[PDB]
Amino acid sequence: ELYVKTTLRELVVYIVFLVDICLLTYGMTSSSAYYYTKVMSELFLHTPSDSGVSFQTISSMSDFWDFAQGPLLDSLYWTKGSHSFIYYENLLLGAPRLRQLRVRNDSCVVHEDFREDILNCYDVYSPDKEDQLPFGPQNGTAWTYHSQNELGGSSHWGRLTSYSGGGYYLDLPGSRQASAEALQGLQEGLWLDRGTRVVFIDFSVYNANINLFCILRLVVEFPATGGTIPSWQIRTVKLIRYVNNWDFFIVGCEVVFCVFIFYYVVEEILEIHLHRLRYLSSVWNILDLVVILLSIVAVGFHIFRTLEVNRLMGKLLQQPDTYADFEFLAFWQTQYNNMNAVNLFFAWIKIFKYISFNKTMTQLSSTLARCAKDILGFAIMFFIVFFAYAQLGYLLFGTQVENFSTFVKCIFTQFRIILGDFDYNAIDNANRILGPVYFVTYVFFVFFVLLNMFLAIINDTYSEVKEELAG
Amino acid sequence: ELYVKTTLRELVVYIVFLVDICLLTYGMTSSSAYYYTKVMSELFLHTPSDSGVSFQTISSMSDFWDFAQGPLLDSLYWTKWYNNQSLGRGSHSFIYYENLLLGAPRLRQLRVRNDSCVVHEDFREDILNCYDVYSPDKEDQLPFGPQNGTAWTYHSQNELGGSSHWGRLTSYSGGGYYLDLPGSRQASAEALQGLQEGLWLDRGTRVVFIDFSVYNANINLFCILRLVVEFPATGGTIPSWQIRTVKLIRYVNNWDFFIVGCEVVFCVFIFYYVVEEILEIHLHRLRYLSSVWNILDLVVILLSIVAVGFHIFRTLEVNRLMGKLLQQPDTYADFEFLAFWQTQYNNMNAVNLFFAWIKIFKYISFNKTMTQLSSTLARCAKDILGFAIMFFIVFFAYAQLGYLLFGTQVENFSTFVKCIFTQFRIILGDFDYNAIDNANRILGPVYFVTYVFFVFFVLLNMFLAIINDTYSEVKEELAGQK
Amino acid sequence: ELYVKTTLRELVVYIVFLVDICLLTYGMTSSSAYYYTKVMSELFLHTPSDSGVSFQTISSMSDFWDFAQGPLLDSLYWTKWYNNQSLGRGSHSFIYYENLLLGAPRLRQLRVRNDSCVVHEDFREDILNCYDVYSPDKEDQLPFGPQNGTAWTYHSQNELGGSSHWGRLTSYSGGGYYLDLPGSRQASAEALQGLQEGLWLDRGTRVVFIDFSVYNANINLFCILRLVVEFPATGGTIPSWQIRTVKLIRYVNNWDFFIVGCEVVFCVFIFYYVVEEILEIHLHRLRYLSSVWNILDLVVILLSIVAVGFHIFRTLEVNRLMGKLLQQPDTYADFEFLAFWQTQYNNMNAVNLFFAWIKIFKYISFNKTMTQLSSTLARCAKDILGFAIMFFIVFFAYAQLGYLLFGTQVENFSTFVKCIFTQFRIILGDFDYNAIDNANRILGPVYFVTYVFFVFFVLLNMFLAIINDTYSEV
Amino acid sequence: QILFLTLLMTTVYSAKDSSRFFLHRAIWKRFSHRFSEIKTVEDFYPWANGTLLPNLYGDYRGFITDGNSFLLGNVLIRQTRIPNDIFFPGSLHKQMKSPPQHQEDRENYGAGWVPPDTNITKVDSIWHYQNQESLGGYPIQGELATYSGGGYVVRLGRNHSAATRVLQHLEQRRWLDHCTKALFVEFTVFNANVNLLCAVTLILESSGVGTFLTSLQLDSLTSLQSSERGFAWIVSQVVYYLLVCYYAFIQGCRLKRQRLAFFTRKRNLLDTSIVLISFSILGLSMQSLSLLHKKMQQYHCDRDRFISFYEALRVNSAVTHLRGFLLLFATVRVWDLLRHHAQLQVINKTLSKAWDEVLGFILIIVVLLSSYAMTFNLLFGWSISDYQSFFRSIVTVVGLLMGTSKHKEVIALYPILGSLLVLSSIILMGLVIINLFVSAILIAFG
Ligand SMILES: *[C@@H]1O[C@H](CO)[C@@H](O)[C@H](O)[C@H]1NC(C)=O
Ligand SMILES: *[C@@H]1O[C@H](CO)[C@@H](O)[C@H](O)[C@H]1NC(C)=O
Ligand SMILES: *[C@@H]1O[C@H](CO)[C@@H](O)[C@H](O)[C@H]1NC(C)=O
Ligand SMILES: *[C@@H]1O[C@H](CO)[C@@H](O)[C@H](O)[C@H]1NC(C)=O
Ligand SMILES: *[C@@H]1O[C@H](CO)[C@@H](O)[C@H](O)[C@H]1NC(C)=O
Ligand SMILES: *[C@@H]1O[C@H](CO)[C@@H](O)[C@H](O)[C@H]1NC(C)=O
Ligand SMILES: *[C@@H]1O[C@H](CO)[C@@H](O)[C@H](O)[C@H]1NC(C)=O
Ligand SMILES: *[C@@H]1O[C@H](CO)[C@@H](O)[C@H](O)[C@H]1NC(C)=O
Ligand SMILES: *[C@@H]1O[C@H](CO)[C@@H](O)[C@H](O)[C@H]1NC(C)=O
Ligand SMILES: *[C@@H]1O[C@H](CO)[C@@H](O)[C@H](O)[C@H]1NC(C)=O
Ligand SMILES: [Ca+2]
Ligand SMILES: [Ca+2]
Ligand SMILES: [Ca+2]
Ligand SMILES: [Ca+2]
Ligand SMILES: [Ca+2]
């Protein structure tokens, strides 16, 4: 029935740890990190130009130059000194930066029958084939190459390539007329020609009423075929400040959490002394060591974060009018968030090693151990046909549908079909003959294996009890 | 356990065959084939005119001329940079600055006859002519308009060297009235103006095709575009399109001098599988046609031989086309035929690879009875046949009822097979109830509610039936032993 | 086993009858009736004017006149090609160059009285007019405006030979104030200008109808269009439409002349099935009314009789309409009555066919194929009735509660029947919860969560009840 | 009693109104046009001049936008501020400041938000403060706060001329500036074609980042007669309200002969509560109509003054909430009266072992939903709107279980994690139901 497990002490000293780990993850999260993202997205991605071109609807180089000299400068510069306050409250930090990565002039040698019409060839992007020589007037910082170490920066796994960190850049000047002059001079000479492979626009803003950084990066990729593909990443960073009451409380509970993880690691290595073998038998110990690992890396990132933020702010006010790299911080703070949520999930479900509820959390393992060697041979049979269908759907559709454009996309598309999220008209317009067949036969296969697994476990139970009763 | 059967060597050679065909299939599919189609299809279908007419929103004979003279010539002919600085390579249209326009675009048209009807006498004094719906028997072959050009006289299908085409209403022929658009944008604007002035789209017109094709050399690929507009007998337009990205030229690279090394292996593996599937026939003279694995081992060999046969035809025809393009430009090169058949070849290859993947259970099969079920095929021989021909009767009755109630208002019920698939999707929780409720707000709800109750009823029935049957037989098989 | 019931002499006769009625009901449906409706509705319901007012987005009376002037005369009257060269056929308007416009369009309006209700006692010297909601007894029947023409005097439903109409709020009568539009487009523009200057639409107006018809001869089909705009007593406007594609003339070519043989054999089959069903009741006097497969035969016979009657009714009515169309043009021809009843005839035919298939299911039998659940609910038929009543009383309580909490802010809850169907749809996984969460921030989530837990509880109970029955005894 | 319960349910299932929907819809559609395109307080003036004045004074003298709806009195524009505490950060990045959340403005300024002159009082200006008691008491619950009932108040109405006069006088003098929190536009409307009195509030409130959120709040009340609702409705209601008094007398003579144990039986707590609620409903209905009449007494004395009908609408909302409870109690009582006079036990006592399955299965549920809700809120709560908070996430996960919400954006955002979380859910539920099958088939065999 319902009864505390294995002692009364560990349960209370764990329901203390659970309560303490829930407040450390709600002292990092703000409730105005969704309004902020929503508003900055509405400002920079939806605002149309004359000719009505938003960033989300850029489809050529002309559209890029229309968005850049129109709504970008209009959205980055407000007034009512020598500073910008977007919407009067969000201060712009430093200078926005345009960056471009190109590809070499002779990379993908042309066929035999076309080399009298087409003379030079530009491959797809790859760090091997890349252009590093000056072009245009060969004069400024936007017409010469600076490697990834000079421009201290990191790769970006955006779309199709995972672009590098160097390239040809331009830091926009202070006022609006100066930036307009710079961009017009950048356009009059062909800054974007057949060699251009990607363009980034990076900047960041800081709001002080709520305490937040909004870090914006807009990417536009120019494939080897023409046109553009735009993408964006908008992230938010906290910057906690240590004066208030609540913040002193949070510092205290930080110390408590560190003490707790020390206690738990010493207890695990203390009971490893007892019964060395069989210690790998229980899954709960695996959960404990997983939580320990995640907690120590959590505190690691928590100190590194403060290091880098003080460094950034120092460089930022010591010499403004330059570019302050907030992108590294945003990326890794997001990864830290994604990790802390998982750690919280595990800490929450680790209470079934404790106060127990009967007729479910007693025989799920009793049935799982019985329902094995008949389901491992049922998963090797399901995934063969699952991946066969994945390849069939990648090869039938996938030049027309985006959800089938690659292999992993097909995998998750089939998963979503199982969950009940499909767009049947897309599959049906792609192929009017094999679209329906693919759909129908896939659904039937899934339901078939489901009910066969069900019947297998039912007959297993039957036989088991029949041999256990009348034996 | 994993009961590996059939002289494991056979498994180790079939795995080699499988790896070879996966190397031969994925080595000819580009990853940039989707982003080619995407941009070439958002340039020609989503580009508005001054009046705001895209190709997808053509709804009159006047929108067709609004689009054909605006966003079509604008997108076809590229001659300057975005800063009004001329491109270097001249007398050649480089769409998006990378994609070379091959040959000349073509406009073709099919019209219907004048006296292809009866004008039932009540209206015989108001309405004088009746033009039928499209069908090859009822087809006009006379000249019209000024009656002299190539856009005003009829050319048969053997003369144009054409082929059929499956549209949204019917399947059109290959002949018709055509006009090629060579030269600059100013030379095409005049030709299109000439077609508009003397009425080229009149009451007899039934379909209009626009064909062209571009080639990209950065990634060795072709995009063939065919934009179709159908003018039904009722009036209005229906626009559709086929945009096909294909790799017709195989080897320009270093990887491709290796994949040929793969394919010659393929052509001998086939010879190893047809030389042995005849020995079994010699040993099992007619018991060879007993299992179905010997039936899949025939389909896969046949599809492989058909692929080997298509390779040669593709090579010969691409050589012919590339020669014609070079020896006489300013004329239309028929790339649509090859693009269609290359796409069909790709489809057949994907199906063959799927069958080769699922033919792995013929070699390495586990031991859950047969499939942990045949236990239910004991009393299924007389129960499942009775359970299917009783569920499908009511299913198809509901299909007919839904096609007859809705189907002049809702599109998902436009035809019979559309209702079939619509109901199949209703079972999976994917329905639009408001359309059904607007089509008829009395019988719509009745249809919907009774249908979902019927399927829930048969689901519950099947479930409890199978559990009860297996229980009964396990009980009696326990009782019989003691 | 699927042994055959009553002798093969009966099963083969019924099979012949079944395929006969299938040929009948599928020979009279055309492949191009969805595209006709599509293009016509897209031409009249989606085309916007300068200022972009399409019929679907009419929201005032000024918007109504905007639509009625610009994109209603532009779509109705066609007299030139796209290269502004005139079509040859004169004095007629061929929409899309193919669809002949029959007769003359008609505008109709139903008004309410200046004093249909009494104002509240407090606001009796501030508010001087009371316009009730529409009802046939509160209906202005006096002239207004210039008080002279047909658009300013009342015409009864028997003078305007006409019928009802079930809109989105009520059912409206068949008389009122009307105007027929003339031949050309400029004359129609001047007539509408005169209707707008002298204020035809005031706050007494409750509903406006625009009726016209079109015939396509390439395919052999009619399209009858009726556009309705309703002006509730609460303010606002609600547009709706009825676009009916029908086939009233149905003997033109040889494929149709084949169908007359099927119709004759249908009549003789009905004669046979009514003489046969009496020799089945001449024997079993009132034991006849025990078999359920006998109510279905009576229903099928009745429906076939009604269809045979409507056949000749439609013939006479269409003859009369064509006569009066030819002899006195420039007048409105009431094609909407015949169109409505032809659509209802088609619905009835669909239902009759659906029942014919079930009768075929009766003729052959299966020993026990889906009698497995029927057996269990014939045995355990007491507790399931308790669960049925306990589910239904809570279901209706929840429907009423959802009508109380929401139903002023959300449409899906604005009516008891809408609440019933919205809950039924929640059960199937189709619901926009953000609406009811905007409507009420506390009781929205409560309503939703408790309803879902109640549904899950009832299903769990039913399953534990029926699977605990297949194991009772051994 | 059969008649008593049937009368109660027909008196709760009745009293519906089909016009309160269409009135709200008409008004909302007309006034919310282009309202959400206001980001800053610089845009409020083109919106006010374009789609607020043409609708408040709609071409029939006295009515809003088509006739059909009389305007009752003046139109109020109110605003609550934060004190102008001169910040101008500039060089203020080291040791960044914390703006206070204890600040409201309660001082009387004088034209231009400057110090006032030596008449320290509380005059009726657009710059002096107005108490909530002085004003129509009505704390407004906005979207991200619960603003007060006071503030800085202007009234511009009853023509189109005076409205534009003061709207160009407010802008020229900078009445609305950066120290402005929520802003409110308030008016009242009466429709005599379908007797209904509606109150409209338009709320423009300030978020953190300088930008505004927009909202509308409509509240309606039907002042018919409470007695002249027609025949065949007064008779049923009068017999029902006589039977309510009968049952009140029954329970009274039952309590006097008991003096205790009256609260120990369910058959007594379920009828006394119904009696009390049925009395209070009609009491509060008469009270609401009286309040409305005596507030119209004020309007008839001097119009051109603002009037708040908030008390009547609030007691009417009380009347409405006291009907859900009447319905709930009636349902429970009917269910019991039916389960008694027919042996219709719902569960075959498989849903209990004497106390445990009750609280030994509603803890599994709470733990699992808290786990998944917290994780989904931390992972996706920064972009997706259905996971903004903990309770939003609770409702959304319950919807996922039911099927009304789909995993289309949580897979489009985090495929690698979102896929594994769904997989965990499915495996857990499948194991649960397989256990429910095997334990069942093993019970009836041993
Ligand atoms: C490629 O570009 C370079 C620029 O560095 C130029 O010098 C060279 O001539 C180009 N090659 C061709 C074949 O145009
Ligand atoms: C740019 O070119 C100018 C001459 O036009 C030269 O003096 C200068 O050194 C170059 N580099 C710069 C400005 O960085
Ligand atoms: C466009 O190019 C032409 C070509 O010479 C030029 O005359 C004109 O000024 C250009 N217009 C621009 C750049 O706006
Ligand atoms: C009907 O078609 C015939 C066939 O060419 C043609 O000669 C005749 O002029 C057409 N009639 C009309 C009215 O266009
Ligand atoms: C036009 O028609 C005439 C005679 O019908 C023909 O001789 C001529 O070649 C045609 N083409 C022209 C004039 O371009
Ligand atoms: C339309 O046709 C008329 C007469 O055929 C002509 O005067 C006019 O230029 C044409 N084009 C218009 C009105 O745009
Ligand atoms: C209402 O309408 C009637 C219709 O004849 C008219 O006589 C009357 O003057 C109007 N106004 C009032 C206030 O009754
Ligand atoms: C109204 O009809 C009468 C009857 O002939 C006529 O005298 C009068 O001129 C008409 N008024 C208008 C505005 O047409
Ligand atoms: C207010 O709107 C009207 C009509 O839109 C316009 O005439 C007037 O100038 C506007 N007022 C201002 C201050 O823009
Ligand atoms: C405007 O309203 C004021 C009072 O609200 C009144 O004194 C004045 O006469 C009105 N002006 C007009 C033109 O009605
Ligand atoms: Ca923290
Ligand atoms: Ca441990
Ligand atoms: Ca789902
Ligand atoms: Ca074989
Ligand atoms: Ca009978």
Author numbering:
A (entry chain D): 94 to 173, 183 to 573
B (entry chain B): 94 to 575
C (entry chain C): 94 to 567
D (entry chain A): 1664 to 2109
From the paper:
The recombinantly expressed complex can be activated upon washout of the applied acid solution. It can also be gated by transient extracellular calcium exposure followed by inactivation in an intracellular Ca2+-dependent manner. Consistent with a previous photo bleaching study and similar to the structure of PKD1/2, the PKD1L3/2L1 complex adopts a 1:3 stoichiometric assembly with a conventional domain-swapped voltage-gated ion channels (VGICs) architecture. The heterotetramer, with a pseudo-symmetric TRP architecture of 1:3 stoichiometry, has an asymmetric selectivity filter (SF) guarded by Lys2069 from PKD1L3 and Asp523 from the three PKD2L1 subunits.
The half-maps of reconstructions of the apo and Ca2+-loaded complex revealed an unambiguous density that was present only in the SF vestibule of the Ca2+-loaded complex, but not the apo one. A Ca2+ ion was thereby assigned to this density. The Ca2+ is coordinated by the C = O groups of Leu2063, Gly2066, and Ser2068 in PKD1L3, and by the C = O of Leu521 and Gly522 as well as the carboxylate of Asp523 in PKD2L1-III (right). The distance between the C = O groups and the Ca2+ ion ranges between 2.9 and 5.9 Å, indicating a partially hydrated state of the bound ion. Upon addition of Ca2+, Lys2069 swings upwards, resulting in an enlarged outer mouth with altered electrostatic potential distribution. The Ca2+ is predominately coordinated by carboxylate of Glu356. In the presence of Ca2+, VSDIII undergoes a downward and lateral motion that pushes S4–S5III toward S5 and S6 of PKD1L3 (PD1L3). While the Lys switch in the SF may respond to Ca2+ loading spontaneously, a cascade of conformational changes may lead to pore opening upon Ca2+ binding to the extracellular site in VSDIII.
